[PDB]
Design a protein around this motif. Structure first.
Motif, PDB file in Angstrom:
ATOM      1  N   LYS A  79     -18.953  -9.753  -1.581  1.00 52.63           N
ATOM      2  CA  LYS A  79     -19.926  -9.207  -2.523  1.00 52.63           C
ATOM      3  C   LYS A  79     -21.312  -9.837  -2.394  1.00 52.63           C
ATOM      4  N   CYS A  80     -21.697 -10.203  -1.177  1.00 48.26           N
ATOM      5  CA  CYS A  80     -23.007 -10.839  -0.973  1.00 48.26           C
ATOM      6  C   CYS A  80     -24.191  -9.888  -1.192  1.00 48.26           C
ATOM      7  N   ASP A  81     -23.910  -8.613  -1.436  1.00 49.46           N
ATOM      8  CA  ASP A  81     -24.962  -7.665  -1.803  1.00 49.46           C
ATOM      9  C   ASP A  81     -25.347  -7.787  -3.275  1.00 49.46           C
ATOM     10  N   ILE A 141     -17.616 -17.388   6.153  1.00 50.47           N
ATOM     11  CA  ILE A 141     -18.381 -16.192   6.465  1.00 50.47           C
ATOM     12  C   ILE A 141     -18.614 -15.410   5.182  1.00 50.47           C
ATOM     13  N   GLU A 142     -19.862 -15.018   4.935  1.00 53.14           N
ATOM     14  CA  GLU A 142     -20.145 -14.148   3.790  1.00 53.14           C
ATOM     15  C   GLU A 142     -20.149 -12.693   4.205  1.00 53.14           C
ATOM     16  N   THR A 143     -19.692 -11.847   3.298  1.00 58.23           N
ATOM     17  CA  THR A 143     -19.523 -10.430   3.602  1.00 58.23           C
ATOM     18  C   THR A 143     -19.987  -9.558   2.439  1.00 58.23           C
ATOM     19  N   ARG A 203     -21.226  -3.319   4.656  1.00 58.80           N
ATOM     20  CA  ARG A 203     -20.541  -3.679   5.905  1.00 58.80           C
ATOM     21  C   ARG A 203     -21.010  -4.983   6.569  1.00 58.80           C
ATOM     22  N   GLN A 204     -22.016  -5.637   5.999  1.00 57.06           N
ATOM     23  CA  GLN A 204     -22.506  -6.871   6.599  1.00 57.06           C
ATOM     24  C   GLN A 204     -21.408  -7.929   6.631  1.00 57.06           C
ATOM     25  N   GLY A 205     -21.204  -8.552   7.794  1.00 57.83           N
ATOM     26  CA  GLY A 205     -20.235  -9.627   7.935  1.00 57.83           C
ATOM     27  C   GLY A 205     -18.767  -9.226   8.043  1.00 57.83           C
ATOM     28  N   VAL A 206     -18.468  -7.944   7.863  1.00 55.62           N
ATOM     29  CA  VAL A 206     -17.074  -7.504   7.828  1.00 55.62           C
ATOM     30  C   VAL A 206     -16.409  -7.701   9.191  1.00 55.62           C
ATOM     31  N   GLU A 207     -17.047  -7.209  10.239  1.00 54.00           N
ATOM     32  CA  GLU A 207     -16.529  -7.488  11.574  1.00 54.00           C
ATOM     33  C   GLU A 207     -16.504  -8.995  11.872  1.00 54.00           C
ATOM     34  N   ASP A 208     -17.559  -9.734  11.508  1.00 59.46           N
ATOM     35  CA  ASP A 208     -17.537 -11.177  11.723  1.00 59.46           C
ATOM     36  C   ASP A 208     -16.273 -11.775  11.122  1.00 59.46           C
ATOM     37  N   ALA A 209     -15.965 -11.403   9.881  1.00 57.40           N
ATOM     38  CA  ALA A 209     -14.850 -12.056   9.186  1.00 57.40           C
ATOM     39  C   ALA A 209     -13.512 -11.821   9.895  1.00 57.40           C
TER      40      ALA A 209
HETATM   41  O1  LIG Z   1     -24.748 -11.053   5.769  1.00 55.99           O
HETATM   42  C1  LIG Z   1     -23.740 -10.801   6.681  1.00 55.99           C
HETATM   43  C2  LIG Z   1     -24.237  -9.967   7.822  1.00 55.99           C
HETATM   44  O2  LIG Z   1     -24.634 -10.904   8.781  1.00 55.99           O
HETATM   45  C3  LIG Z   1     -23.953 -12.095   8.562  1.00 55.99           C
HETATM   46  O3  LIG Z   1     -24.850 -13.139   8.558  1.00 55.99           O
HETATM   47  C4  LIG Z   1     -24.597 -14.000   7.491  1.00 55.99           C
HETATM   48  C5  LIG Z   1     -23.805 -13.217   6.485  1.00 55.99           C
HETATM   49  C6  LIG Z   1     -23.284 -12.064   7.269  1.00 55.99           C
END
Ligand SMILES: O[C@H]1CO[C@H]2OCC[C@H]21
Ligand SMILES: Nc1nc2c(ncn2[C@@H]2O[C@H](COP(=O)(O)OP(=O)(O)NP(=O)(O)O)[C@@H](O)[C@H]2O)c(=O)[nH]1
Ligand SMILES: O[C@H]1CO[C@H]2OCC[C@H]21
Ligand SMILES: O[C@H]1CO[C@H]2OCC[C@H]21
Ligand SMILES: O[C@H]1CO[C@H]2OCC[C@H]21
Ligand SMILES: O[C@H]1CO[C@H]2OCC[C@H]21
Ligand SMILES: O[C@H]1CO[C@H]2OCC[C@H]21
Ligand SMILES: O[C@H]1CO[C@H]2OCC[C@H]21
Ligand SMILES: O[C@H]1CO[C@H]2OCC[C@H]21
Ligand SMILES: O[C@H]1CO[C@H]2OCC[C@H]21
Ligand SMILES: O[C@H]1CO[C@H]2OCC[C@H]21
Ligand SMILES: O[C@H]1CO[C@H]2OCC[C@H]21
Ligand SMILES: O[C@H]1CO[C@H]2OCC[C@H]21
Ligand SMILES: O[C@H]1CO[C@H]2OCC[C@H]21
Ligand SMILES: [Ca+2]
Ligand SMILES: [Ca+2]
Ligand SMILES: [Ca+2]
Ligand SMILES: [Mg+2]
Length: 156
Positions: free
Chosen positions: A107-109, A132-134, A139-145
């Motif tokens: 919920k970083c939005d 990792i924040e998502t 969708r930000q960070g979802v693939e990263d996580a």
């Molecule tokens: O905000 C989302 C999208 O990009 C990544 O960077 C830090 C948090 C993640």
């Protein structure tokens, strides 16, 4: 064909299902229907390897898992404090402390942040895992996580 069993855990309402649905289907679930136990499969290429992700979405309201996303929401201090209990439950069921995990602040939005990034980073550091924040919404960070979890599993 090389499969990874990812288990998503965390307090009720933190966005476990929304994250999972965003990863698999690329849309945002706006409504809140509490989960019991749902699993999904998706075939993806991660770092040159075709693999099957089996994602077990659990109730916030484990035995078969190879890696765990421990999810809290950044506007939900109780969910963050709960992370300790979730990790302990995981280690109890796995009978080991050597379990691949990623800590996820969802919920970083949203702007009502009560868990500061540095606090979460320090928690992750103490566990020896990435933070990792998502946002399931953007969708930000979802693939990263999810992909970082796969990459952690490959290290064990
Ligand atoms: O905000 C989302 C999208 O990009 C990544 O960077 C830090 C948090 C993640
Ligand atoms: N703004 C925003 N809302 C989100 C985000 N992720 C989830 N939500 C909202 O939070 C509510 C709960 O999401 P949900 O995915 O069902 O949470 P859960 O962790 O799976 N709950 P449960 O443990 O009961 O199954 C929904 O209304 C959803 O739209 C996010 O990143 N941002
Ligand atoms: O599920 C959403 C709506 O209610 C809040 O409670 C904690 C999670 C939040
Ligand atoms: O969109 C990214 C994150 O999720 C994977 O699914 C197919 C495409 C990949
Ligand atoms: O309305 C709730 C459910 O979805 C989120 O989007 C922003 C507000 C949150
Ligand atoms: O009602 C609040 C708590 O649950 C979400 O669902 C959509 C509206 C949001
Ligand atoms: O139907 C609404 C009211 O009860 C919740 O349970 C799942 C769906 C939600
Ligand atoms: O359980 C997942 C799959 O269906 C979506 O709707 C509400 C919860 C989400
Ligand atoms: O959504 C809640 C309410 O009904 C149960 O059915 C499966 C999920 C649970
Ligand atoms: O089976 C794959 C392809 O479609 C997605 O939906 C849920 C499971 C995922
Ligand atoms: O008990 C909570 C915490 O872990 C999940 O597993 C199934 C029920 C959920
Ligand atoms: O605060 C309690 C009740 O709502 C859940 O959401 C995360 C924290 C849990
Ligand atoms: O059951 C959860 C909550 O308390 C912890 O003790 C070990 C298992 C964890
Ligand atoms: O889900 C709807 C309502 O909120 C917007 O955010 C991105 C998608 C849009
Ligand atoms: Ca939607
Ligand atoms: Ca045990
Ligand atoms: Ca990325
Ligand atoms: Mg759910």
């Amino acid at each position: 064909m090389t499969e990874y069993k990812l288990v998503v855990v965390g307090a009720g309402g933190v966005g476990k299902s929304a994250l999972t649905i965003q990863l698999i289907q690329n849309h945002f679930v706006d409504e809140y229907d509490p989960t019991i136990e749902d699993s999904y499969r998706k075939q993806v290429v991660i770092d040159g390897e075709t693999c099957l992700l089996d994602i077990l979405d659990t109730a916030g309201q484990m035995r078969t898992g190879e890696g765990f996303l421990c999810v809290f929401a950044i506007n939900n201090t109780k969910s963050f404090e709960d992370i300790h209990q979730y990790r302990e439950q995981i280690k109890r069921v796995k009978d080991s402390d050597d379990v691949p995990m990623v800590l996820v602040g969802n919920k970083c939005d949203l702007a009502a942040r009560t868990v500061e990034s540095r606090q979460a980073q320090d928690l992750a550091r103490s566990y020896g895992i990435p933070y990792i924040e998502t946002s399931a919404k953007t969708r930000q960070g979802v693939e990263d996580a999810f992909y970082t979890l796969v990459r952690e599993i490959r290290q064990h």
